Each structure stands twice: as C-alpha cells, then as structure tokens.
C-alpha cells in the first residue's frame, strides 16, 4: 500500500546514493580499473555466412566457442573451453563423440600442402583433454590420448588409440589395432580386448554423463536459486530430531543424480 | 608508487560501501537480481598500475584473457583461449603477428628463479596453436610450431622456424633459418625458401581472417538470445 510506496521511494533514494558513492570511489581510483561490462563471448557464431548446425541432443558448454560450419551428430557433446573453429572448411563431428575439455580443432586454409581436406570425426570417438587436432580425419570408434597433437594429413583407423602427449607427424596413418605415441610415430604395442571393452565403455559413459552437465548449465536464474537454497537446506542430516518429530526428510529428486553415473 | 596503492585501496573501500548501499536499496525494494552467477570475466584484466595497452586496429577474442602490462601491436590477432599474462614485466606483441587458439605467454611469475625476463614478440611471428612461450624473446618473421614449449631466456632470431611439439631448453638460441624439434629441441634441417615465403603468407592470411572476425564478432548482442535465456 502507501507504506510499500514509501519504502520503494526510500529504496530508490538509497540505490541512487549508493551508485553515486560507487562512482566517487571509482573516480578516486584514478580510473585504473577495467570495468566488468557484459559477457560478449558467444557460442555458435557465424564466421562469414555459414552457421554451425548443431543437433538438439548435443551438449555444448557455454565456455566453448564453436564457430564456422560445424556439423555435430546426435548424442555427442562439447565440453568447457573447447574450440571448434571451422572458419575455412567444414568440421563434420560424428554422433556419439566427445570433444573433451580445452581441446582445439582447427582446419587449414585449403593450402597447407595443396590437397587439404576438411577435418572429419567418426562416431563413438573420444578425443581427450587438451588435444590438438589440425586437419585430421578421425574415423569411427577411435581413441585419442589427452594432449595429443595430431597434425595435418593424419588418418587414425578404428580402434587405433593414440598415446597421450603424442606428436603424430604430417600425413601419418595409424593402422587399426595399433597404438602410436611419442614425438615420432613410435609404435608401442597391439590392441587388447580388455582395452577395446574399456574404449567402448568409456565412450558410452561420457554420453550418459554429458546430459547432467547439459541440464545444469542450462538452468534459469529463478530455478538455480531454488536449487541452491534446497542444497543448502539438505546439506547435512539429523536423525535424532527427525525421529523425535515423527517425520522423515527425503532429498528432492532434482538434487539426485541418475544412477547411471554413480560408480 | 606506494601512495598510489593507498588511494587504490581507499577506492576499493568506497566502491564496496557504495555497492553494499546499492544492494541494500535493491533488496529493500524486493528484488534479488544481484545474486546471479554472471561470469565476472574481463578480456582486458589489469592490476593496480599496468592497464594493458592494445592497438585499436588489433583484434582480441572475447575468450582471450589479456592480463598485466601486455602491449599489442598493429594488425596482430589475439585468438580464442589465449592467456597472455604480463603482470611482472612487459609483454610486447609485434605488429602483424598472431597468437592462435589455446595459447599463452608467461612472464615467469616467481622471482625466485633468478631474474624475470620480459617477453618480446617480433613482427609477423606466426605463433602456433597451444604455444606455451615461457617468457622468451622472439624476433620478427618467424614461425612457432603447434605444441611448442619455449622456455625463458630463449632467443629465437629471425626466420628461426620451430617444429611442432618442441621443448627448446632455456637460454638456447635457435639459429636463423634453422628448424629445431623433438625432446629436446635438436637440429633437424635448414629452413627452405618456399616455407620462408609461406610464413609471411600465413601471417597475412591470418591477419585478414582476424579482420573478418573482428568485423563480424563486433555485431550487436542480438537481444533475441537475451529474451530466450530469460524466458525459460
């Protein structure tokens, strides 16, 4: 009512005074601080005229920068910090892959050797942390070690793990069932069935893991505050008073992860 | 000097007092939009008295985090994910060069390891992807491979192309027109003339491509997505 109107007026006066005092404090600093401004970083931007056609089931982390003509299949996911720069040539990311954290995918400008091809990634393919893929042509169900540095012209066959921290040189083909790593090609060993089972289970594990990150990163402000308050309320339990009051406290469904991601 | 830092601290005090008054006024009106988890990142983060200076004709990606005393030359590009940090000393970035995706430049923060060496980047230096230059000077018209690990005290002189995955040891100059690669950086061969032209060609094409992005990455905020985010 009128008391509410008066309180709103007092709130406006206090807000104005606080903003003025903030301005004065900023002036006293000598204007040596860069203002925060607003998040200008945008996912899925248009490079020249071509937009990235990303599927509905794909998880793209807000920190990622997927630009250029990028074609991403169903079930796959792009994680935080990753950059799918596709300005020059198309990047056909398959279905069921996972370009993991801080990974970079870039394509040469059709003239790195005269016969450049766009980067292509198959299905059920894991890339790993902070890998560098520059013009590779990964095919389906292949493992890439974290921190790998696949240069241009390389083709990795199915079930052909690249060791982590590798430096696969130009136009190097990795046969299916072989594990190549180190600064040179440097074949190590053959495949094992335990390892193929591990590859398949990790590939499916990241697919059934990505959806919780997709849901959490896409929650509205009016919803994230509610979840934060609920998590604060149910941070710790007390069976004593719960039993004494004749009540039971069950965690809300929105605070419980699906059983597929639990160990 | 010391006196300036005192005024900077008093500025923080007064700014926070005014900010708290603003929060009290907003909260008294029945609004809690100050509790959002907005990403508080600045692409030109500074310290007390560094304030990174960037040329107006240069292009810096929104994901780039230019921190410290970083100086950026004319026409150079600062791509997505690079972590150029120049707090202790100057980090001069040449005119026409480029710093690619997911790269960075140190200044060797800790002063324990001898004297801190400022980082110098020459003109038309095609710094590669995932470059981790650890406070080393780099002369003009040269190429740095992807995944290179240049360390402090290294003087990569003119046309000193550096192979991918290199780990050139500290205080080891790369001879002009000579490639060094492997673990550690060992002599491989001598630089050829077609690659000599290709270095400048790639620099020019990357500068033009950066100009194109800066033309298209400065587009207005497209409030359609702003309404999309709020309406959920």
């Amino acid at each position: 009512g009128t008391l509410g109107r008066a309180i709103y007026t007092v709130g406006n006066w206090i807000r104005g005074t606080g903003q003025a005092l903030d301005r004065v404090g900023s002036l006293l600093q000598g204007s040596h601080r860069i203002e925060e401004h607003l998040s200008r970083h945008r996912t899925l931007m248009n490079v020249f005229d071509k937009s990235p056609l990303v599927d509905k089931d794909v998880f793209v982390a807000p920190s990622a920068s997927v630009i250029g003509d990028v074609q991403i299949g169903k079930g796959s996911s792009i994680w935080y910090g990753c950059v799918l720069r596709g300005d020059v040539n198309n990047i056909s990311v398959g279905s069921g892959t996972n370009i993991q954290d801080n990974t970079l995918v870039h394509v040469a400008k059709t003239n790195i050797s005269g016969k450049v091809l766009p980067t292509l990634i198959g299905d059920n393919v894991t890339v790993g942390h902070s890998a560098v893929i520059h013009g590779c042509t990964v095919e389906d169900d292949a493992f890439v070690g974290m921190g790998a540095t696949l240069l241009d012209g390389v083709v990795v066959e199915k079930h052909a793990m690249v060791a982590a921290g590798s430096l696969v040189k130009q136009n190097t083909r990795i046969p299916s069932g072989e594990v190549w790593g180190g600064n040179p090609a440097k074949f190590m060993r053959k495949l094992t069935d335990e390892e193929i089972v591990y590859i398949s289970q990790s590939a499916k594990n990241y697919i059934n893991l990505a959806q919780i990150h997709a849901s959490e990163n896409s929650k509205s402000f009016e919803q994230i505050e509610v979840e934060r308050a609920l998590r604060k309320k149910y941070a710790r339990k007390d069976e004593d008073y719960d039993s004494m009051l004749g009540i039971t406290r069950e965690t809300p469904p929105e605070l419980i992860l699906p059983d597929n991601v639990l160990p | 000097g010391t006196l300036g830092r005192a005024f900077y601290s008093v500025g923080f005090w007064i700014r926070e007092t005014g900010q708290a008054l603003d929060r009290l006024g907003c909260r008294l009106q029945g609004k809690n939009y100050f509790r959002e988890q907005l990403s508080r990142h600045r692409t030109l983060m500074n310290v007390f008295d560094k304030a990174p200076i960037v040329d107006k004709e240069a292009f810096v990606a929104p994901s780039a985090s230019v921190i410290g005393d970083v100086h950026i030359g004319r026409g150079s590009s600062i791509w997505y994910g690079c972590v150029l940090r120049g707090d202790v000393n100057t980090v001069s970035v040449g005119s026409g060069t480029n710093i690619q995706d997911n790269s960075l430049v140190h200044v060797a923060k800790s002063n324990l390891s001898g004297k801190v060496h400022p980082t110098i980047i020459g003109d038309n230096v095609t710094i590669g992807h995932s470059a981790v230059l650890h406070g080393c000077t780099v002369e003009d018209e040269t190429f740095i491979g992807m995944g290179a690990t240049l360390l402090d005290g290294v003087v990569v002189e003119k046309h000193g192309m550096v192979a991918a995955g290199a780990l050139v040891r500290q205080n080891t100059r790369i001879p002009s027109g000579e490639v060094w690669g492997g673990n550690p950086a060992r002599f491989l061969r001598k630089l050829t003339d077609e690659e000599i032209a290709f270095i400048s060609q790639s620099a020019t094409n990357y500068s033009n491509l950066a100009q194109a992005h800066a033309a298209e990455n400065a587009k207005p905020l497209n409030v359609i997505e702003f309404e999309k985010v709020l309406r959920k």
Binding site: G1, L3, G4, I7, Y8 | G30
Partner: peptide, 30 residues
C-alpha cells in the same frame, strides 16, 4: 514497479527504522 508488494517485510523495515530513531533519540535525549 512502484510498490514493494510484500505485506510482511514492510513491517519489519518500519520496525527497524523506528528502532534506529529510538536509538538515536535515546543517545541524544539522555
């Protein structure tokens, strides 16, 4: 956007401000 529209917080706020006024008067009048 002209009224706080909360029939529970406003009484608390007026109680707080009258408490502040009472405190300043008690310091002054005594």
């Amino acid at each position: 956007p002209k009224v706080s529209e909360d029939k529970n917080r406003n009484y608390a706020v007026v109680a707080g401000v009258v408490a502040i006024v009472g405190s300043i008067g008690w310091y002054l009048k005594a």
